[PDB]
Design an enzyme around this catalytic site. Structure first.
Site: not given
Lengths: 140, 93, 5, 93, 141, 5
Positions: E29, E88, E130
């Site tokens: 996302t 990400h 992450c």
């Protein structure tokens, strides 16, 4: 800002010194490691740590030792030091009879699981391989 | 609250993925260098600065000597992994 | 000699 | 000769294995804190010490807010990985 | 000589890779807030006198080609190198807008043997991503 | 609101 290092005790320095391994690990005797263990004992003695030297522990003995140390009352201690001298792989340290995950050992000391070390520096010094890559270096 | 992973320092002898070297008579390169730098500077320097000098000593003063060409003339850099939230001095004041 | 760990 | 992995620094926003947090209006906790500490301190502190203040700011001043209970009230610690061999200052004498 | 030599003519490059929108393939996302970070970094490293290059929404192929290309420039008059990755990620992995890239593949272009004009100079990689799916619940102080 | 990366 700086950690408060004026509690009554600097803290424990646990030195785990694994020299001889089971043949199944395929590790050859770690010649030279006794020199390291005595050098460390003296160095941290001089820094006023309560040094405990342990030699040739199986992986079960390492975990049981670290669990037990984590359950002590470190209230009057400023810090915690653990030195591991062994064979390793990435994320892994060897007992004399096989590997244990480093996370297993360090998790005993997490802020929520060892409350008398919460907010205090927890130092893990690790002399062990982290794989089999070789660094050929570069001329300077 | 603080994170449960804060206030750890991992002083690894070598970079992720690599071998770590040990002299059969003098001990591992990393611990030889760590004890020497603590002896010289623990009275003065913050611990990350001590560990950076250990990095330098290991990186520059050691190279492997082996009868096996595969393992000969190799090098090492330690790896400091800090989740510390404050400076660390081994003295007070 | 140097040995690995 | 020096190691080919020497003189790298990896300033990770979070500890190995964990999520990293981003505020949808103000940006990531780590970058907000890194920029603030560099603005405040780059004219005087060595970089590992700036990064240690970034660790402290992320660890103490931030906690997630989420409509999803699963992700609510969580914490973060950044992870400094230094293969540096010298002190780093963003100024010169 | 306990400090890096930072008085070359140039402080160096600061490459900012800002990935906000991901291929509907990937399933990731939108990373709302990342443009604030990108703009904040650009201004922070400008004030540190870095030559900043901002790049947005790069595929994994474009990240590998950019970092390869930057690693083949002549950094002889530069003191240092900085790369910032906003995206990400997973442990050891950064995402291009269409898929993962190993961080090792990116940083290997700058190894002392492969980027000779950065040998002996600090190479800084700042990574906002992450590294897995663990949650830190904290401990009350 | 906070989101994960």
């Amino acid at each position: 800002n700086s950690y408060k290092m004026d509690y009554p005790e600097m803290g424990l320095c646990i030195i785990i010194n694994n020299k001889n391994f089971h043949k199944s690990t395929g590790m050859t005797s770690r010649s030279g490691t006794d020199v390291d263990a005595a050098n460390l004992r003296e160095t941290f003695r001089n820094l006023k740590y309560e040094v405990r030297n342990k030699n040739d522990l199986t992986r079960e003995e390492i975990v049981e030792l670290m669990r037990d140390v984590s359950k002590e009352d470190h209230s009057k201690r400023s810090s915690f030091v653990c030195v591991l001298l062994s064979h390793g792989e990435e994320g892994i340290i060897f007992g004399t009879n096989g590997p244990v995950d480093l996370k297993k050992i360090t998790n005993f000391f997490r802020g929520d699981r060892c409350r008398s070390l919460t907010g205090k520096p927890k130092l893990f010094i690790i002399q062990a391989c982290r794989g089999t890559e070789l660094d050929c270096g570069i001329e300077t | 609250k603080i994170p449960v992973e804060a206030d750890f320092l991992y002083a690894y002898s070598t970079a992720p993925g690599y071998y770590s070297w040990r002299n059969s008579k003098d001990g591992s390169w990393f611990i030889q260098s760590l004890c020497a730098m603590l002896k010289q500077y623990a009275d003065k320097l913050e611990f990350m600065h001590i560990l950076t000098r250990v990095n330098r000593k290991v990186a520059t003063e050691f190279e492997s000597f082996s009868f096996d060409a595969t393992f000969h003339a190799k090098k090492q850099i330690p790896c400091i992994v800090s989740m510390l939230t404050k400076e660390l001095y081994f003295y007070h004041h | 000699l140097d040995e690995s760990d």
